[PDB]
Write a protein that binds this ligand. Structure first.
Ligand SMILES: Nc1nc2c(ncn2[C@@H]2O[C@H](COP(=O)(O)OP(=O)(O)OP(=O)(O)O)[C@@H](O)[C@H]2O)c(=O)[nH]1
Ligand SMILES: Nc1nc2c(ncn2[C@@H]2O[C@H](COP(=O)(O)OP(=O)(O)OP(=O)(O)O)[C@@H](O)[C@H]2O)c(=O)[nH]1
Ligand SMILES: Nc1nc2c(ncn2[C@@H]2O[C@H](COP(=O)(O)OP(=O)(O)O)[C@@H](O)[C@H]2O)c(=O)[nH]1
Ligand SMILES: [Mg+2]
Ligand SMILES: [Mg+2]
Lengths: 430, 200, 434, 48, 57, 71, 439, 71
């Protein structure tokens, strides 16, 4: 009954998935042994969206973890909440990706995806009414970006009607974490633009900014960064699992956010976020939430949205609140900032309300917005890619698996015309 | 909803006031003192413990209905010994107003006017006589069975071992009646008219 | 012997039905369990039905494609009241898509509702008509709503159908694609609804803020106000009164022509108890407040147009000689002007049952109340505003792939604009003086 | 007699146990999610 | 005043919680139980037979 | 519907009450208790106003305790 | 003084006869041991049980039934259970080797060594009776021994007795759901056999009753016991008028005189009302009007067939409980008023109504609710051509290349039987199309 | 077959009850017992509904126990 299955790949994908399943389990009151210990009934009615059932009343997530090296899944199994996952859901090789898109997409993932496609196929038919898929992977790596995109294409060929949502960690060159990341980044986007229904880009530089300027904590770690993504990940589907004044699912958010099919790249943000030494002075009211929600520095991407026009925005509120202020605040912010919104669509903000706030908080909000300012990261990646590809640097590694430069040429254009067409809507007038 | 921390405390308070309006709205024969009497029947062994199914039956028989998630909230808060049984005695100890100070004046002064012997205990028959006189002008002093026939006006409360009405239970009976009526002026109107004493 | 059947479709229809069916149960004394408390006047026959073995079940059907809101009705305090198989729910939401709820997942569920409707109709003997509730700015609200009314026209025909739609507010709203499914809905319900009432939300926000003294209103507050309008409208069907008016005696006195049946409502007195301690709540004044454009329940100003017909109902302790005096004063004031060809334009009904109050509500208990249903040419402004928003966005063909890809031809919008466009032309031509 | 079916349907060739090059790839807009182009318009009647 | 804990309600693992014992037949109170007859008048396995009619095979 | 009451205030009279009325001398429309009825209705309205004000104040205090706890 | 002999063949016939006989015993107040309970010591009057039972001259009652099979497991289970003291020891005829889903085996090789014993027992049951109304036969048709022995018994009974009535409650295969893979063959052959030898045939496919149990009784995992209970209730409602007082009485002979327009047309489908679970049983009032409206609902047809695709020929409804003829007439008028139900041109009046007073009985552990009113329908319509039409395609697909034909040929059946069976089926199809057209 | 009850509810009256009935003025078909009979039938139905609900609840619990043991 509109349940979604979760599939993740790569080191970044596995680490993010590890923190996400811990967050969801606490929301529904699931112990590390898989036994329900909730206190109300609202925490059990919609538990089948993310959890299966077995003998003894225990629940197992319908998650699938894939990698070309069992090194990453080695650490996740020994951590807390590691016994929740099915042993049969782990699919791995024994060679490795090599930070090479070609290896993860033509010579290693291709021969390995037969087994994982069987696992996801078993999960898809078992559920009552499949609602869609969600993806967590990084575009800067080999097995995540390479084999991940191949699975995206393969799944779409068998379920063309179900929804497909992705969480992509696109590389910001400031964290030059891989010298050959421009090759993988531009090749993954070209594959991603044709199949994925919704995409949500995430940047490590933005996450460092949040942990440093907003939370004001001295020593950030990937544990903290992964939790920020996990908190936003649950917010987009919170209304699907709990009652609310207005109900909204993945399909409803997509329908109200994508004017044209090729324009399906968003940015996400979460609020409230306050430091330990600064929440003594702040007040918890709806105007405060919408003030931090639209702040430029709060976005989880390196793209600054004050250089472009919001094509469309979406907000999902949590907790008990008055509907009037929710509709009033969105109208108020839309009028005072008429230069930051495109003009040929009136009232381009969607609102939804859920009655169950996150544990420990009384109010919350998750922001998903389609802004034309995201073209600036594609421009930066493309210009770096054409600089490296002009001299054919690092090319022999990709060509060694039979990959031809014609595919590289086509990857540039599809990214290029994406930027060109996505820019003229900023200058469009009515 | 989301009764993690103080959510449990605030969720019960909504039920505490929601019960009060329902009892106040009817304004008629429904009294909170019937709840303690109706729960004793289901308790059987005078344990003081009731499970969810029997607790729901008593409330619904009284005419008070809530949601399924609402009933679970009451059980978690009021299960002090963690045995899966709610404490109806603890539940009835709450949601009960103490009585306002001005209401205390009328309750005591009505008692004191009848209690002219200063002993603090009033013969139940004396209440029966004055309650009928204020209702009919042709009652006449003499009656055939003035004790039993007119005694139906009293004995709704309970007496001590001596049979005399203790003042402590005299105010206890009247304070519980002061839940179905939220209009203090109407509480004034009922008491002064039905007892024929008005002074404030 | 006289009954009505209520149709609730969409989240707006169902969530309003929760407020309406709370009032009806308490007004007639029905418990949430369905049993009669009092030992104990067949006034409940209009809305409830005697199912024999004890309880009473309503003559209502709830329709939705998402089971989230329906589960609350099956779990809330009224779980034991409604029949288990009259709460029809799907599996997938229409997702703000008119085409999805009208062409793809409409046929799979519209058959279940028709089967349920027939059984309810066969029970009734003198069925007056149908009442439908739907939110125009939604998927299943506009999608299934059009499909049901289109199908209901040929299934029954001469039976009257009344509608209480919710058009989007001039500027404040929830969805962003709502102009598309709002135009297509009006393009359907024009030729399939006998009487339609505009119930946009922004007007109700102003009323609650101005009168009830509430700084944080919620949809529960709005639904209680709307349920009052329904109760007063149908009060004369079950309670004795000096002047009785039925459902059939509305369109016989309130629609000049079949094409013109769009109306805007009002209600009075709408006052909080704190400031009800000062005003005198006379018959003469509550009808004066009913004509105030700020108190109107739809965001339209009648001062920009003419009144064609005016149906207004009193309940409480009104006296007909007091009503006649008030009508004379209304005709005197110049700022209210009627159309030329309507020398008399008032239909008045009187009921004796005073309005009932919902516990936990905010309206003050009073012995007098009046409900207003007005037909005026000023309602052409809301269509003009909706036309501008639709044409503005449709110029660049946005969001249209999600409508073409569900089997809906692209030519729907062209005819929907033409159908709407002719409507203003008719409304302006009627008001021209001869 | 027909029972035309929409989004999900219930028949497939190899849904359960289907599984038994570099030259070919997705070129520009063969994907479902791309290709911002729309078909031609028809008059429609609606009068029926 | 204290950090974050994982296990709620203090549920000890079945690994160390007592030991195995002869309850292997917990379900098999109705495992040789016939339902062609049965589920018609009784819910327990049929008692051993003592009488048979002619041609019982 | 039906009309069983002549007005909201008075019901139909007893058959012995209408002794004459063949010649138009009594009409029972002259009231003569109008002022007392209005005076009593005033107090009946005031009682409801006070009750509802008390209920609203109690609700407001219950709402304030919410923020008091969350702080 | 009026009796009916029940014939049960095959596993389906036996497993439906079990439910039928437990229901009859509980209805007439006979303990499984075969005698009334010892608590009631007032002697005895009644005698209504004489239709189904017979006094043995010393105490207990013996049913007028016979059980038949070639696989002894089910019959041994019958004679091992709590009903071992009720049935006569040697009226439970059992063979040695089952036909194993082979019509030729069950009709030409094995059944001929048991038909003689069967007819001997039938004579021993018939000579005892004096007012024999007819025979009731139950059979699953997609099974080898079932179809074969049913065909042989009907063939031999048609000449042993002649004009005695026979009623067949066959169970044809569902449109898509089935257990075997070869059932179209013997289904067609059995259809040929029973075309010329049955007076009334009732359609009882399994998918329709599965749908009834799922939608109405709210049972997510039904089993054959529920199916048998429903069929037994149908049989009881059909035969109730023969053994209880009523305001309007109908005999067995008054089915083939008011439901059979022509001798060739005797195939008809049934329905029952009300079938409602106790959670919502009498949270709807279940008046006579609505129960007779639900009796006409296409989804409640006990055969998977929609009457909207054809025209009605005749109707036969039996009410039991506290119904009233004036309410029945009002309901009939309303049904005739409804337009979605239409009758054939040459049948201006098409209803025969019978009323019985004994309310339906409830079996412990059942699913239905205790009701004071009930209606059972037997309707004949042109829509019955659907099951023949869809069954035709299945046979041709696997017969165009002689699949499984060697199994049937090697058992002594001529190869030419298939073509003539198909020709008779096609001729049967043409009859229903030609009758329904307007003049 | 038999027709011994003129209706399911009331049987044939004793011969002393029909004192007249030669002139058609007393018909005995006018009930005068309809309302109370229907009312009583209501509770007689409700008791059966309660009994069946309790029985099915017991059956469901018995079904659950065996799975709990198999675990
Ligand atoms: N006045 C009022 N309007 C409501 C209420 N609930 C929903 N709405 C209206 O409904 C519109 C959005 O549609 P939804 O209620 O979310 O659901 P829907 O109309 O059934 O459409 P779907 O989401 O596709 O199911 C909003 O614009 C609101 O105006 C309510 O309680 N009161
Ligand atoms: N409704 C119902 N159908 C049954 C039942 N038992 C068997 N059937 C049907 O009978 C078909 C197979 O024939 P059976 O009766 O089982 O076997 P048979 O008639 O003895 O023939 P053989 O298998 O050769 O012995 C199955 O496809 C079922 O549909 C039953 O108890 N109830
Ligand atoms: N947010 C986040 N990013 C990570 C994490 N681990 C790795 N990354 C990012 O992923 C990139 C490298 O990805 P990689 O490990 O090669 O992916 P793989 O090849 O699929 O395993 C680096 O730029 C990191 O910034 C993590 O736990 N959280
Ligand atoms: Mg919705
Ligand atoms: Mg067999």
């Amino acid at each position: 009954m509109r349940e979604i299955v979760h599939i993740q790949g790569g080191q970044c994908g596995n680490q993010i998935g590890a923190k996400f399943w811990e967050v969801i389990s606490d929301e529904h009151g699931i112990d590390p042994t898989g036994t329900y210990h909730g206190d109300s009934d609202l925490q059990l009615e919609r538990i089948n969206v993310y959890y299966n059932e077995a003998t003894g009343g225990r629940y197992v997530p319908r998650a699938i973890l894939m990698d070309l090296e069992p090194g990453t899944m080695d650490s996740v199994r020994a951590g807390p909440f590691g016994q929740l996952f099915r042993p049969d859901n782990f699919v791995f090789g024994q060679t490795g990706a090599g930070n090479n898109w070609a290896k993860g997409h033509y010579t290693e993932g291709a021969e390995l995806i037969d087994s994982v496609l069987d696992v996801v196929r078993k999960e898809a038919e078992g559920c009552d009414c499949l609602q869609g898929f969600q993806i967590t992977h990084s575009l800067g790596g080999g097995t995540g970006s390479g084999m991940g995109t191949l699975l995206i294409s393969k799944v779409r060929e068998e379920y063309p009607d179900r929804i497909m949502e992705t969480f992509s960690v696109v590389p910001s060159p400031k964290v030059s974490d891989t010298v050959v990341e421009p090759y993988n980044a531009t090749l993954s986007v070209h594959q991603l633009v044709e199949n994925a229904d919704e995409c949500m880009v995430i940047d490590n530089e933005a996450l460092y900014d949040i942990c440093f300027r907003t939370l004001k904590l001295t020593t950030p770690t990937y544990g903290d960064l992964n939790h920020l993504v996990s908190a936003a990940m649950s917010g987009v589907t919170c209304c699907l699992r709990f009652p609310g004044q207005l109900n909204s699912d993945l399909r409803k958010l997509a329908v109200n956010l994508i004017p044209f099919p090729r324009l399906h790249f968003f940015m996400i943000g979460f609020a409230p976020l306050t430091s330990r030494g600064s929440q003594q002075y702040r007040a918890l009211t709806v105007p405060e939430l919408t003030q931090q929600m639209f702040d430029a520095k709060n976005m989880m991407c390196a793209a600054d949205p004050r250089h472009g026009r919001y094509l469309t925005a979406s907000a999902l509120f949590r907790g008990r609140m008055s509907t009037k202020e929710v509709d009033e605040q969105m109208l108020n912010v839309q009028n005072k900032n008429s230069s930051y919104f495109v003009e040929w669509i009136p009232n381009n903000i969607k609102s939804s309300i859920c009655d169950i706030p996150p544990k420990g908080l009384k109010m919350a909000v998750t922001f998903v917005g389609n802004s034309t300012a995201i073209q600036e990261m594609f421009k930066r990646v493309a210009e770096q890619f054409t600089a490296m590809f002009r001299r054919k640097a690092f090319l022999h590694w990709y060509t060694g698996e039979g990959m031809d430069e014609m595919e590289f040429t086509e990857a540039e254009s599809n990214m290029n015309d994406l930027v060109s067409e996505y820019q003229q809507y900023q200058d469009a007038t009515a | 909803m989301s009764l993690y921390g103080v959510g449990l405390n605030v969720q019960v308070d909504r039920i505490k006031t929601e019960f009060r309006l329902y009892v106040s709205k009817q304004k008629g024969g429904l009294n909170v003192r019937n709840l303690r009497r109706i729960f004793e029947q289901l308790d059987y062994q005078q344990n003081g413990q009731l499970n969810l199914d029997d607790f729901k039956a008593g409330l619904n028989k009284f005419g008070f209905f809530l949601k399924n998630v609402d009933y679970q909230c009451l059980l978690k808060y009021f299960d002090v010994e963690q045995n899966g049984n709610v404490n109806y005695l603890a539940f009835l100890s709450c949601i009960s107003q103490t009585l306002n100070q001005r209401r205390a004046n009328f309750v005591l002064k009505v008692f004191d006017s009848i209690d002219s012997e200063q002993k603090g205990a009033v013969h139940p028959f004396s209440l029966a006589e004055r309650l009928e006189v204020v209702k009919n002008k042709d009652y006449q002093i003499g009656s055939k069975t003035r004790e039993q026939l007119v005694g139906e006006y009293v004995a709704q409360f309970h007496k001590n071992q001596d049979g005399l009405i203790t003042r402590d239970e005299f105010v206890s009976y009247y304070e519980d009646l002061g839940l179905g009526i939220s209009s203090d002026q109407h509480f004034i109107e009922i008491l002064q008219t039905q007892w024929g004493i008005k002074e404030d | 012997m006289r009954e009505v059947i209520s149709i609730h479709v969409g989240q707006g229809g169902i969530q309003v039905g929760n407020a309406c069916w709370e009032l009806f149960c308490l007004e007639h004394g029905i418990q949430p369990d369905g049993q009669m408390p009092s030992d104990r006047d067949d006034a409940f026959n209009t809305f409830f039905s005697e199912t024999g073995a004890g309880k009473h079940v309503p003559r209502a059907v709830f329709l939705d494609l998402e089971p989230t809101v329906i589960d609350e009705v099956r779990t809330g305090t009224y779980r034991q009241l409604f029949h288990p198989e009259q709460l029809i729910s799907g599996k997938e939401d229409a997702a703000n898509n008119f085409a999805r709820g009208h062409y793809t997942i409409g046929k799979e569920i519209v058959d279940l509702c028709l089967d349920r409707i027939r059984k309810l109709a066969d029970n009734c003997t003198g069925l007056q008509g149908f009442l439908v509730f739907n939110s125009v700015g939604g998927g299943t609200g506009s999608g299934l709503g059009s499909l049901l009314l289109e199908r209901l026209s040929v299934d029954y025909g001469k039976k009257s159908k009344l509608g209480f739609t919710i058009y989007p507010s001039p500027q404040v709203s929830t969805a962003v694609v709502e102009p598309y499914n709002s135009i297509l809905s009006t393009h359907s319900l024009l030729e399939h609804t006998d009487v339609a009432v505009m119930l946009d939300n922004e007007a109700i926000y102003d009323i609650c803020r101005r009168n009830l003294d509430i700084e944080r209103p919620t949809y529960t507050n709005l639904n209680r106000l709307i349920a009052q309008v329904i109760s007063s409208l149908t009060a004369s069907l079950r309670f004795d009164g000096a002047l009785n008016v039925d459902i059939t005696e509305f369109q016989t006195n309130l629609v000049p022509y079949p094409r013109i049946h769009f109306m805007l409502s009002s209600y009075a007195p709408i006052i909080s108890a704190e400031k009800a301690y000062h005003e005198q709540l006379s018959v003469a004044e509550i009808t004066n407040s009913a004509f105030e454009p700020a108190n109107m329940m739809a965001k339209c100003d009648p001062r920009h147009g003419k009144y064609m017909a005016c149906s207004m109902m009193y309940r409480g302790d009104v006296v007909p000689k007091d009503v006649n005096a008030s009508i004379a004063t209304i005709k005197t004031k110049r700022t209210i002007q009627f159309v030329d060809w309507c020398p008399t334009g008032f239909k008045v009904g009187i009921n004796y049952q005073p309005p009932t109050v919902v516990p936990g509500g905010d309206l003050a208990k009073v012995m007098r109340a009046v409900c207003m249903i007005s037909n005026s040419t000023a309602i052409a402004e809301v269509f003009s505003r909706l036309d501008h928003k639709f044409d503005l966005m449709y110029a660049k063909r946005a969001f249209v792939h999600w409508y073409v890809g569900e089997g809906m031809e692209e030519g729907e919008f062209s005819e929907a604009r033409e159908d709407l466009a002719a409507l203003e032309k008719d409304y302006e031509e009627v008001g021209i003086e001869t | 007699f027909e029972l035309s079916k929409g989004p999900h349907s219930h028949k497939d060739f190899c849904s359960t146990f289907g599984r038994v090059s570099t030259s070919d790839f997705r070129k520009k807009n063969t994907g479902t999610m791309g290709s911002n182009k729309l078909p031609i318009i028809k008059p429609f009647k609606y009068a029926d | 005043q204290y950090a974050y804990d994982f296990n709620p309600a203090k549920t000890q693992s079945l690994q160390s919680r007592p030991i195995e014992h002869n309850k292997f037949s917990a379900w098999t109170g109705d495992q040789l139980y016939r339902t062609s007859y049965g589920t018609h008048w009784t819910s327990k396995p049929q008692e051993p037979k003592t009488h048979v009619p002619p041609g019982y095979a | 519907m039906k009309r069983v009451k002549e007005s909201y205030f008075r019901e139909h009279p007893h058959w012995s009450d209408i002794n004459g009325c063949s010649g138009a001398k009594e009409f029972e429309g002259e009231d003569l208790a109008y002022d007392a009825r209005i005076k009593y209705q005033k107090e009946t309205q005031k009682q409801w106003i006070e009750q509802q004000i008390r209920e609203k104040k109690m609700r407001e205090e219950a709402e304030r305790n919410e923020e008091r706890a969350y702080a």
